[PDB]
C-alpha cells in the first residue's frame, strides 16, 4: 500500500485483515512498513 | 677454577663468572667442553662471513636487476620513434 | 555420498578428484566443503552460539561433512595437505571454533555428536599437521589457537573430570569419554608442539605442577611412535 | 604501456551517456541520492567544478557482522543478548569490519576485469553506495532508491558490464566502456530518470529501474598516484609564505576579489592558517590529465575552492593579483620552480618550496612588501607582480592539507547557505511539513559532528591541551555561523 | 688454481661492473633529449 | 666589531655556522650553490 | 647530476650581497683582514 509496489489503496482494508493491547502492537508494525507520509493521513 | 672462583661475591669478574655462579645452584650437568668447542676449523674466518650456493645466486640476481632497470625501456622508446617516422613515409606514400 | 565417493583410496583416487583437470571440473571441492561448513556454523568469526541448535539433526550431515572433511582428510599428505595448508591459512576456522567452544543447548545425543565432531575435526587436523611438519602452516593453525596451552589445559581438566564423574559402562561403543576427547586433543597439541616452541613452553608447564590430570593422561600415554612407511620417508607418529 | 587498468583503487570519474548526458553529482553533502545535471558541462568539457564524481574501485567487503550488529536495533527493542554478550557480539562485528580492511589492503593489485562484482565509495563527501530493494524513489515507486551511506551496505554489489556487453566476459575493462551496472541483490539496474527536482531546473534523479542507461569509464588519474605524499591531481594546497609567515588571502573587499595576504598575528607561534588558503593546482592538457608525470615542463592553473574563481594576473599600470572566473586563458596558466636545488629527481615533488615563472610576460614573481590602502592599518590590499628578479623572500611552499576538515567545513557552509534559504522560506510565511523532518533537527547534528568545542574541561582560562577543535569552533563562527545566527533570530522573531 | 663459492661470485661482480659502466648513462642522456623536445611542443601549445 | 685575522697556522675562530640568509632553507639539507650564507662564529659570538 | 655539492674541499669563491656588494679580497699578502671593494666588478662579471 505505502510504497510504489502498489498505489495508495486502502489502509482500512489492510487493517481489517489485522487492524486487547495486541492490535496496537500489530498496528505499530504495519505502520512501520506504512509509517509517516500521511499514511494515516494529513490532519 | 673452582677454587679461585669460590671465595667472593661472584659478581666481580662476571661474564663467565656470574654466568656459572648461578649455574651451580640448579646443577644442570652441562658446563663442560663436551665435544663441540674443540678449537680449530677457523677456515680463515669463514671466507669473510660469505655464504652458500645461494649467496652467489643472490649476487647474480642483484647485478641483473640493477643493470636491467634501464636499457629495454630506452630501446622501446627509440623503436617507437623510428616506427613513428616510417609511418610518416607511409602517409606520404598514401597521400594524395 | 559425495564425501564417501571421494574418500575412496587417496593418492591417485584422492588426488585425482582433489585437483582434477578443467579447473577441478568447475570444482575444487575441499575449499567448497570448508565454505559450506562455515556457512553451517556461519561462525564468520565467532560461531553464533546455537547455530548448532539451529543445525538440529542437520549438523550431523555437516559433521559427516566434517567427516567428509576427514573423508578428504586421510593420509594423502600432498594433495590432501595442499588443500589442508590452503585451508589452514584460509579457513581453518570451523575446526578452530569447534576446538574453542562447546554448544549452548545441552544436546541429547548432541553431547556425543559434538564430541565426535571434535575428535573428527581433531583427527583431520592432526593428520594434516603431522604429515606436513609444515611449521608455520601449523603456526597458522596455531595462529588459529592463540589461546594455546591455557585453553588446552582448561579443556583437558574439564573433560577428564566430567568423564571420571560419570564414567560410562558401555564398552567399546565409542570412547567418547570427556577424557577420551581430551586425550585426542592432547595428542594433537603434542603433535602441534613439534611445530611451535611457545606452545611447547606451555606444554612443559603442563607437565610439571602439583601433578594433575595432565601428567596422568600423558602417562596414560607419551609414546611418539616414529614409524616410517613404504619407503623414502622420515615420519613421526603419535597415538594414545 | 603494455595494457592499462590493473589496480583496484583507481582515481577516475563517471559520465552519463544517452538520453540525458550528465555526471555523477551529489547534490550537496547532506542529501541521499545523486542527480543528473544538464547544468553540468560537456562530456569533452567538464564543468567549472567536477570534483563530485570521486569514486574508487572498492573491494567487495562483507556486511553480515555489521548486519548482525544492526540486528542490534531490534535488540534495542528487545534485550538479553544483552550486556557483555551483546557488546562482545557487536565488538566481534567490529573486528570483522577491521578484517574487511585487513583484506582490502591485501586486495590492492587486482586487474579489474569484466563481469566482476565490486563496491564503490565517494571521496569528496566520502559516502557509500547502496540501492534499496524495498524503499522506492521519489518520482516512481518502481524505481529504487540509491542511497549515500555512512558505513556501506549490501547494495554496493554491482555488475561491471558495458552497454551491449559486446566486449566479451573475462577481459579487462577498457577505459571508455559504457558501463551498464546491475545490483546483485536489488535486481533493477540504474536509471538516469529525466525528471525535474527540487531546487533543480536543472537536475535529474539517479535511480534504479529496468532501462537502457549507459555510462562511461572516465579516467582522471592513474592508481600509482595513491601515494598521499605525492602532490598529484586536484589535490589542494595552501599558498603560505614562510619568511613572512603569511598565507595568500583573497577577499572581495571593494566588490573585487583582491588577493593579498593578511597581517600575521602571533608568529612567534605558527600560522593561524585561515580559510583564505583554499588552493588546488592542476596541470593543463585538453584531454584532462595527460601522461608522463615528470612535472618538469608541466604548466599549471590555480583554483580556489569556495569561490568559483581561478587565478590569473595582468598588468597594473598606475603585475596584478586578483582571481578570474574562467579557465581557458593562457594568462592564468602559471608555472613553478621546485625548491631551487640541483634536482633531476623531481618527477613528483612533495610539500616543499616553490616559485613561479611567467609565460607571456615571462618573468619571475617577486613578493616585495608594498603596503597600499589607507582603509585600515595592518592592511588588506597589497601587490604581487611579475618581475624578472628572484630573492630568498619568495619562500612559498605547499601544505599537505588535512582532508577531513575541508570536507566538514564545506558541507557546513553549504548547509548554512541552504539554511539561509530555509530561513527565507519561513520568513515569507510558514514552512512545509517534511522540512522539519529533514533538516531542521539536523542543526546540532552538524554542530555535534566535530562537536564545535561546545563542551570541554576546566582549567585556567587559556585553552591549551586537548578537547574539541578550536579550528572547528572558529570555522563554525566562520561560515556565517553569523548567517545562522540571523536565521535563528528570524525563527524566533517570526514566532 | 680456481677458488670457492666466492670466486664465481667475484666473476659475476666483475662482469656486471664493466658491463654496467655505460648503458644507463646513455639512456639518461637520450631520455633528457627526448623530453627536451616534447617541452618544445608544449611551448608551442602554450605559445601565444 | 671583532678582528677577523689571517693566521699562518689557524685557530679556534675558524669555527663557523653554515647558515643562509633567513635560514628559510630548513636545517639538515645540503647547501644549495647560491645560498646567501650568513655564517656565525661559534666561540666568538658576533657574526660577520 | 643527481644532486651537487657533496665533497669538502671544493673549488669555489665568495661574494658580498646587500649593502656593499663586494668580494672576499685579501689586501695584499702581509695584511690581516680582508676588504670589501666596490672597486671589484659585477656579481655577474667578476
Ligand atoms: N602564527 C601566528 N602568529 C601570531 N598570531 C597568530 C598566529 N596564528 C594565528 N594567530 C592570530 O593571532 C591571534 C592570537 O594572538 C589569533 O588567535 C585567535 O585564534 C583563535 C582560533 O580560533 C582562538 O580563539 P578560540 O577559538 O576561542 O580558541 C584564539 O583565542 P584562544 O586563546 O581562546 O584560543 C584567538 O582568538 C590568531 O588569528 P585571529 O586574529 O584571532 O583571527
Author numbering:
A (entry chain C): 1299 to 1317, 1323 to 1346
B (entry chain B): 2644 to 2739
C (entry chain C): 1972 to 2211
D (entry chain B): 4 to 321, 353 to 529
E (entry chain A): 2692 to 2739
F (entry chain A): 146 to 193
G (entry chain A): 4 to 49
The authors write:
To further investigate how the structure of the InsP3R channel allows for ligand-initiated gating, we have now determined the 3D structure of InsP3R1 bound to adenophostin A (AdA), a highly potent agonist of InsP3Rs,8,9 to 4.1 Å resolution using single-particle cryo-EM analysis. To understand how ligand-binding triggers a drastic change in the permeability of InsP3R channel to specific ions, we determined the structure of InsP3R1 in the presence of activating concentrations of AdA (100 nM) and Ca2+ (300 nM), which works as a co-agonist to promote channel opening, as demonstrated in numerous electrophysiological studies. The map resulting from the class of AdA-bound InsP3R1 particles exhibited robust density bridging the β-TF2 and ARM1 domains. AdA is uniquely oriented such that its 3′′- and 4′′-phosphates interact with the ARM1 domain and the adenosine moiety bridges the binding pocket interacting with the β-TF2 domain. Specifically, the vicinal 3′′- and 4′′-phosphate groups of AdA extensively interact with residues of the ARM1 domain, while the adenine ring of AdA interfaces with residues of the β-TF2 domain on the opposite side of the ligand-binding pocket. These complementary interactions provide the impetus for pulling the two domains towards each other, reducing the interstitial space of the binding pocket by 5 Å in the AdA-InsP3R1 structure. Ligand binding in the tetrameric channel results in a 5 Å closure of the cleft between the ARM1 and β-TF2 domains, while β-TF1 acts as a pivot for the concerted movement of ARM1 and β-TF2.
